[PDB]
Design a protein around this ligand. Structure first.
Ligand SMILES: [Zn+2]
Ligand SMILES: [Zn+2]
Ligand SMILES: [Zn+2]
Ligand SMILES: [Zn+2]
Ligand SMILES: [Zn+2]
Ligand SMILES: [Zn+2]
Ligand SMILES: [Zn+2]
Ligand SMILES: [Zn+2]
Lengths: 478, 478, 478, 478
């Protein structure tokens, strides 16, 4: 039991002064001057904002990938998220091609058991068969999964060509699941990788050039039009480019339910990082899609302000220096990914709220609420109201923090925002009504987190069903 | 006290089964299986949706205009809104040029005392001076006004040119008031009127021709760029054209807070109505901006679906055949306006929700919540939650109604949708906790409604303030 | 706008020939041979007195009371007032014991929405608690209330005992509010009722005997000495007895601000009405305090001439024959109250001015100006001057009226001055600058009236503050 | 022309912030921020109260009386008033017995010529005849007299017995004039003087004992009951006693128009002053009626608070020590009279307003407005309104003054309030639009004052006529 007193509550749509009482993992009461019940502890939020805790819908804790295993595991990752105000995640079960989805699912459940805060899974469709379709049904009905990931890159690995995307998206529709997509054209990437390697361009500066922005635009257009065609919603992960974002706006402008995710890295970093002359420094930044020329960062902010990008995530996929160095003589073999779970909320607040680019309300929407609506977890999560999960962050608008690999809780030796100072930080993080992060002190305990099931058929399927019924074809009499 | 039992509650975000208890003007409790307190009636809403009652932010009850007085008054018009599910209105105080705003405000407050449902005012800036600027402050500080209308058409009457728009918008920023605008280029309208009359085209068929869609798009661009330049939000009334909508989309794509209102008539009728062979019929459709060719309807529906249009309203401004007939020999003298307060919600439900263009949540957002947020009345209005005003509509998705001047409650002899049959209707309407419409029985009572005051500084001005500091000029030294 | 021409202006202090221009709710100009602005209507007031319209600070429109509801509602009652030259009222919010003051105020505000002329509210303190005290402060700071009513009668219902009277009067002093009192000793009344009923004396003739004059004198004494002890002003409603009037005179002769109100009915009728041979007719007169032996009348006229009574009112509280008949076998169950709003001015004029007891100036003082000063509405009301509200009555000293239920506009089947003919009548009544009564034609409109907010700390509080300083207790050292 | 800027206007009934513009002897405008018209001087009234100038309706400038002539003359007396905030006086024409009234009038007009501020006369009826009766008519019709003084004391000089009172009062009624009376029983005074002196009690301490309070109460009773009987108003000068005040209260409580004037001396001093061991000090206080035992002072304050005393004045009748000393061996030969014209307003303000005994509005009523109303000069005087005479005083509540014969401007060697310190004083005094007292400086000019006519029939005669219509006695037939 925990009563937060004196703060201003801030939701995705309003702000008001009120105390919030938590017990048994839930919000119990919200109102002015509530009394403390005996047993309960008190937290003074005077001068602070109390917001729904962050949901990071894009994590890869201890992912085996590109020859190795991410250096952050489910506990260290989730604990670091907590230190940064993030209170739940959604990670990805990634079966190898031809591996049973269910078997990969149970393996991933075993790995995620050590989570310190709430977690769930998307499941990736890395090959296709009747078995796959059947196992998707089983995951939805029995394992609380309602979203499936598709990768349009990684040729001769896990790439889904059209036949798969069509068949899988069709199945998603049958199941009321949300297809999500990593959108980059895998043929062009493969092709550009070979050509650049053949020219002797082997360093990280080659990485951006192996996948310039139109490669992402193309795949997005494609995913979106497959989606339009089969009558499914669509969530595109890590949008980095104007081209991809413009495809998103074009589709929403026709009334299509398409949602975009953006990472802080793509909002704040440009592709000059990859030309850095220290190898390890430049490789620190190697992720897909890569950081982009500067005109792209402002397009993405505009996307957030105009309602064409809807959520923020980190794609938290950590590799240490020695692991990155696997691609020392071949950039295509640098394990791809950057850390960011701890730093998402602060970076977005600092660059977005302080600048007056975003409101506090949009900050909540973009850090928790939209993700929760999209994946059918609202108002269980991403909401301050009676009966909702007690996942909250007490935000100190004038608190200072300098981001650094020497000081972060992320178990990785590199921070893409090394040396950056932000104003506005999580002074306290509450998960399941417990205080897990309190002014410098992290109290994450392995296994405290719960697996979060997400029901099928978010509400967008209502609307889609009325549309499909309205446009059912009818034969000419004769 | 009134208990609405057995319905599905539908808000701007979600749908869930619960009972809602109203008393003393407010929603007191929401939940399943609520007990009936002693002395409270019960309403059975099984198989029905219970939604916030509609807010129509654009009405002109008993307006004196174009040489006469609108045939619907504040009583009959609010009563008619109630019969159609609309529970509050915002109307316009329109001073003559050189007439004191406070004086016209007090005349309109006198006329509105007969309202049967909650009501409020925007106040129009029809001329400029220091005194006008002073009176604006007093209206905001003392009389619950937080928005000011400007007309960009009506040359040689109430048109505001650039010098007034600039001075007034600047005053709005200082006061935390939202500037709203009627966007048509008045010089062009004037020119084309003169020219059509010179050509010998004096009939109603000449009206759309006198104000083609680019005249709206120009003026929209202008007011929008003025707003951008001075750092204010902007609300555009009765957007009817692709051109204006495209200007709004363009502005919003750059992060600018621009809002757009649309009428059901502009969503559903085209300009063929002006060619009707019966003079009075043609004249009945005469309003500004006029009905447009079909491509514009489609573009406006997509606007609603993409979030570039935000509110619905009616521009409820009623004149009977004998009043319209004042322009018998000169289309420019036909009093401009049509009726719609009663029909807005069902028109929109029937066209948007049954077709699957809009979800029920977006219907709620477009008919109340968004208006409420924009004008700083949320969650007092547009919300089903404890403490909120008990303004509600119970909606029968299988009910039917044919729109007709023979049977509508609007005190006017013409309906622009004569003969249209809708499916999905308001079975019951509740205002201030009272059952004012019940399945064919209208129980509106003169005077019952309250003047609704709207606090200044909706949250958008906070964001703008931070934005302004960030982008302030900095002198060169040295 | 309204030009009243050729009348003699009669105020609380002077009479002079002048024309009076009304526009925008207010008196715009006063002067000899004013010019008629175009659009303005002219009212010919030749040979008439133009006085401030009547204020009746004691009404109970549609009161639920003694197991029923008054037959006059806020529209019918205020329309009737207007026809009788009365242009505004103060009515009473009467919470049930243990009911929130705010909740009652809100209910009453909704019932008064239908009022046709300006109206206000006193709020009754019918029980006591910290929350009552808080609510009193809120009514005063936000809801325009500056007077609180207490009942010393009605044992075992809403009686305020001495602990409540002290606690409330002290709270009124804190808030700059005026305490008002219904002064009868509830315990004596309770006791005499039981006694008379046990003797089998069940008819209306018992009603006066159940509450003889000394019961009023005692309560008045008590409320006055409480007020004196705590340092507050005091207003005593409906003074009917020599004894209570002598208590007011005694207090005032020691420099205490005590005000007294009187009804025309206690000026003009005596207790023989209760021995009427027709049950229903005797019952028609039952109100509290009841009508008195005849020497009380003459004492009250003298109160008015000496400045020991200050206001006139009606305690307008209407019950039809059927409702009175609820006490057919038990006088204590006959609903208490009589009608008067329409008749007060003419009755006072005819008995007071025509006989020469009172000057015309005293008549204005007693009918509007004093009430206005006492409750902090002077000179907004009860004054003829530029800028005051245009609430005016045009009084024809040669006119004549026979009072009758058959023709009065009060919605009740009984008039306590049935068959009385008066000389000097209101020919026209103007409220908010509109002509609402005119030579026999009532043109009152539902809802037209406005809620009139009354500020705290009328000027008697400055004097009491300096008194209190001079009387401060000085300690002796240790 | 004089603009008085930034003061708070204080009247007999309200206060409000406004400037006041005077020109041509008159108030021209009253409003917030008035422009200084050219030619006009400006007076900074910031932080001060602007009030109608005092009217002293009881002065005896250079009166021949008790074998000598009053040491103050019309110029020095009116000058002194100005310095004390008094702007107009009413003095007395006192003809000798058998002397023509017109004759004494013209002499007194010659005397009053030198006045520095506005002045008028009452005329004393010191004997009776058909000629006296005729001349009274002439004085009212041609010389702007509307009030006649009667002396009930001074046996064997100017005393009017009952037959003169009756005939003069009846004649006042025929002419529309107001009877005023010095009420002491002359026979009892004469007897007591004789008896005190035969006892050898020749000192000033015998002076009070020669005319104890009941001698005043008796004459007041008698004057009142004459007025009542003949149907006239009545103004009683210098009331000093409980007894007389109680007769006033009793008469007013029968609805009779009787007014009471009081002097600061009788509010503030007691009879112990006549016992001072120094002869000439004790003789300084000798006037009629004498100062009284302390209980009379609190009773008079209460008469003022209760509305049984109506005006303040001074009976300004100055004699120096050597003239007083004429009664060194015989108190009955001490010329009677004290000074106070200069001190009235400050004494009343300090003792009445600072104490919280009176409001500031009451202070204005008591120092000018009621006198004005009573003698038919309202609103020419005693009023702050457009068209009134610009007689005004600017009051500095924080100013201080110590009253001394050594420093006052009154041309007399004695001050009955020597050494008394007052808080609240007139800083500036304006008469006929001109600043005559300012910052400690007097600028009075001999002859500047005008003679002020008072028209007959003040409105009290309207009420009285209504009564006399109703007293038609009717013969018996059945
Ligand atoms: Zn990816
Ligand atoms: Zn990823
Ligand atoms: Zn418009
Ligand atoms: Zn409009
Ligand atoms: Zn009562
Ligand atoms: Zn009452
Ligand atoms: Zn005298
Ligand atoms: Zn005298």
């Amino acid at each position: 039991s925990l009563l937060i007193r004196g703060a201003t509550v801030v939701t995705h749509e309003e702000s008001y002064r009120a105390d919030v009482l938590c017990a048994n993992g839930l919000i119990q009461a919200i109102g002015e001057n509530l009394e403390t019940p005996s047993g309960c502890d008190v937290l003074d939020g005077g001068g602070q904002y109390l917001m729904p805790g962050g949901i990071d819908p894009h994590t890869h804790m201890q992912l085996p990938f590109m020859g190795t295993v991410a250096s952050e595991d489910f506990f260290s990752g989730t604990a670091a998220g907590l230190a940064g105000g993030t209170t739940s995640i959604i990670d990805f079960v990634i079966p190898n091609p031809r591996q049973s989805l269910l078997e990969a699912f149970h393996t991933w459940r075993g790995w995620a058991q050590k989570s310190a805060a709430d977690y769930g899974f998307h499941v990736a469709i890395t090959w296709w068969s009747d078995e796959v379709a059947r196992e998707m049904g089983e995951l939805v009905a029995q394992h609380g999964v309602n979203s499936f990931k598709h990768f349009m890159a990684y040729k001769n690995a896990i790439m889904a060509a059209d036949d798969t995307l069509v068949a899988s998206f069709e199945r998603c529709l049958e199941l009321g699941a949300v297809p999500t997509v990593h959108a980059e054209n895998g043929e062009l990437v493969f092709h550009l990788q070979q050509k650049l390697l053949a020219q002797g361009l082997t360093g990280p500066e080659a990485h951006p050039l192996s996948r310039p922005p139109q490669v992402e635009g193309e795949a997005a257009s494609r995913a979106i039009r497959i989606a339009e065609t089969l009558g499914t919603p669509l969530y595109l992960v890590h949008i980095s480019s104007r081209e991809a974002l413009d495809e998103i706006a074009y589709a929403r402008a026709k009334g299509q339910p398409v949602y975009g995710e953006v990472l802080a890295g793509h909002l704040l970093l440009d592709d000059s990082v990859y030309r850095h002359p220290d190898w390890a420094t430049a490789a620190g930044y190697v992720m897909s899609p890569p950081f982009r020329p500067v005109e792209h960062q402002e397009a993405l902010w505009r996307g957030l302000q105009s309602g064409n990008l809807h959520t923020t995530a980190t794609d938290h996929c950590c590799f240490c220096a020695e692991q990155k160095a696997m691609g020392r003589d071949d950039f295509s073999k640098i394990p791809n990914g950057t850390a960011g779970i701890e730093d998402r909320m602060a970076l977005l607040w600092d660059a977005g709220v302080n600048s007056g680019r975003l409101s506090m309300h949009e900050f909540v929407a973009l850090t928790s609420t939209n993700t929760a609506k999209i994946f059918n977890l609202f108002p269980r999560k991403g909401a301050i109201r009676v009966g909702a999960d007690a996942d909250l962050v007490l935000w100190d608008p004038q608190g200072s923090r300098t981001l650094s690999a020497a000081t972060h809780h992320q178990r990785v030796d590199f921070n893409i925002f090394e040396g950056r100072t932000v104003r506005g930080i999580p002074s306290h993080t509450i998960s399941q009504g417990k205080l897990l992060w309190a002014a410098g002190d992290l109290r994450a305990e392995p296994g405290a987190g719960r697996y979060v099931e997400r029901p099928a058929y978010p509400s967008v399927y209502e609307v889609l069903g009325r549309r499909a019924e309205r446009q059912r074809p009818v034969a000419v009499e004769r």
